[PDB]
Design an enzyme around this catalytic site. Sequence first.
Site, PDB file in Angstrom:
ATOM      1  N   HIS A  72      -9.277  -0.048  -2.606  1.00 39.55           N
ATOM      2  CA  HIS A  72      -9.492   1.395  -2.744  1.00 39.55           C
ATOM      3  C   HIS A  72      -9.573   1.852  -4.192  1.00 39.55           C
ATOM      4  O   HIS A  72      -9.972   2.980  -4.461  1.00 39.55           O
ATOM      5  CB  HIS A  72      -8.427   2.181  -1.972  1.00 39.55           C
ATOM      6  N   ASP A  84      -6.373   7.423  -1.718  1.00 44.89           N
ATOM      7  CA  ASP A  84      -7.048   7.610  -0.419  1.00 44.89           C
ATOM      8  C   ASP A  84      -6.083   7.789   0.750  1.00 44.89           C
ATOM      9  O   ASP A  84      -4.956   7.281   0.734  1.00 44.89           O
ATOM     10  CB  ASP A  84      -8.055   6.490  -0.095  1.00 44.89           C
ATOM     11  N   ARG A  85      -6.561   8.536   1.747  1.00 40.50           N
ATOM     12  CA  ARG A  85      -5.891   8.772   3.034  1.00 40.50           C
ATOM     13  C   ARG A  85      -4.737   9.767   2.966  1.00 40.50           C
ATOM     14  O   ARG A  85      -4.715  10.733   3.730  1.00 40.50           O
ATOM     15  CB  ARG A  85      -5.478   7.462   3.716  1.00 40.50           C
ATOM     16  N   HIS A  92      -1.153   4.635  -0.686  1.00 40.53           N
ATOM     17  CA  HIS A  92      -2.160   5.564  -0.150  1.00 40.53           C
ATOM     18  C   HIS A  92      -1.791   7.047  -0.243  1.00 40.53           C
ATOM     19  O   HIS A  92      -1.763   7.773   0.757  1.00 40.53           O
ATOM     20  CB  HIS A  92      -2.515   5.181   1.294  1.00 40.53           C
ATOM     21  N   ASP A 133      -4.088  -0.185  -3.737  1.00 37.05           N
ATOM     22  CA  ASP A 133      -4.272   0.886  -2.741  1.00 37.05           C
ATOM     23  C   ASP A 133      -3.292   2.042  -2.936  1.00 37.05           C
ATOM     24  O   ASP A 133      -2.476   2.381  -2.067  1.00 37.05           O
ATOM     25  CB  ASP A 133      -4.249   0.316  -1.302  1.00 37.05           C
ATOM     26  N   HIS A 158      -2.585  -4.836   2.133  1.00 35.08           N
ATOM     27  CA  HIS A 158      -3.929  -4.625   2.703  1.00 35.08           C
ATOM     28  C   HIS A 158      -3.953  -4.335   4.211  1.00 35.08           C
ATOM     29  O   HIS A 158      -4.979  -3.886   4.725  1.00 35.08           O
ATOM     30  CB  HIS A 158      -4.820  -5.832   2.348  1.00 35.08           C
ATOM     31  N   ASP A 167       0.806  -1.231   0.000  1.00 33.59           N
ATOM     32  CA  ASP A 167       0.000   0.000   0.000  1.00 33.59           C
ATOM     33  C   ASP A 167       0.842   1.285   0.000  1.00 33.59           C
ATOM     34  O   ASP A 167       1.847   1.383   0.720  1.00 33.59           O
ATOM     35  CB  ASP A 167      -0.916   0.059   1.231  1.00 33.59           C
TER      36      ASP A 167
HETATM   37 MN   LIG Z   1      -4.780  -0.002   2.261  1.00 33.82          MN
HETATM   38 MN   LIG Z   2      -6.716  -2.538   1.327  1.00 33.95          MN
END
Ligand SMILES: [Mn+2]
Ligand SMILES: [Mn+2]
Length: 294
Positions: free
Chosen positions: A120, A90-91, A61, A87, A243, A59
């Site tokens: 995501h 996001d965030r 992000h 991913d 994840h 990830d």
């Molecule tokens: Mn994630």
């Molecule tokens: Mn995830």
Amino acid sequence: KLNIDSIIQRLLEVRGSKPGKNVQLQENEIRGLCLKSREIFLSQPILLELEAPLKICGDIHGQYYDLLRLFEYGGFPPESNYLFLGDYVDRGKQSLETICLLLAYKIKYPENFFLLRGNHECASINRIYGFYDECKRRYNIKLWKTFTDCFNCLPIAAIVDEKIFCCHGGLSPDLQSMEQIRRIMRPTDVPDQGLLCDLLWSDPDKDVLGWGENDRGVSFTFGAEVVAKFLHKHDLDLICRAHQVVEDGYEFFAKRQLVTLFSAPNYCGEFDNAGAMMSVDETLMCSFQILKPA
Ligand SMILES: [Mn+2]
Ligand SMILES: [Mn+2]
């Protein structure tokens, strides 16, 4: 029409800077990245078959300056080959720069750079957790919809040298044959149940023996015996997934039969976790580069 070299150069121009500084690509260019990468995704298989040497990342992000970091540790394309496990958005505060450089490199090096779908990369999720808001603030909602159409075509899993199974989330109770993954139709949104859902949402769990309920309120958890039987049935050595935030950047499960990778150090600015990146060489030996938070 699309000047990929110029796009990548501007994206990389901010290297070494203090995190936060944006790269302002033009709307037509970002749209171009989505449409062209989408074509490549659909042209290539949904279950990727890849060969080492390869660098694998979890990830990100929207932590763009940590993506740039990963490349300065791992080597900028095409010095190294890359598989990302999803991913991307996001965030974080810079999902746009993050996904744009990844799509740029995919178009530039389509046989040496690979991106899998994370949970995501789905409109229903990234509408809530920041990407929609970022697209609206910096461009418009139409651009966000163009990303959605792109994301809906991303591949779902990879097998590296017939031995490492790679996906964002984990295994599925409905996964009996690899042909089932190959028969998933794109474009598609991620459903609330079934094989595609599980591949992007499930987690391993030490306290569960077989299959159990997932605290996320979607998909399942799976135990070490499920991992053991999956590897034996399909003649694999390792499951490589992401994840989940892990303190050391990577974490083994079920006596080194599964590994979780996470490549966003200091995730959300809340956790004090390292990022990591798995390197796979020609002899199918796995090693890890660690990115401590700064
Ligand atoms: Mn994630
Ligand atoms: Mn995830």
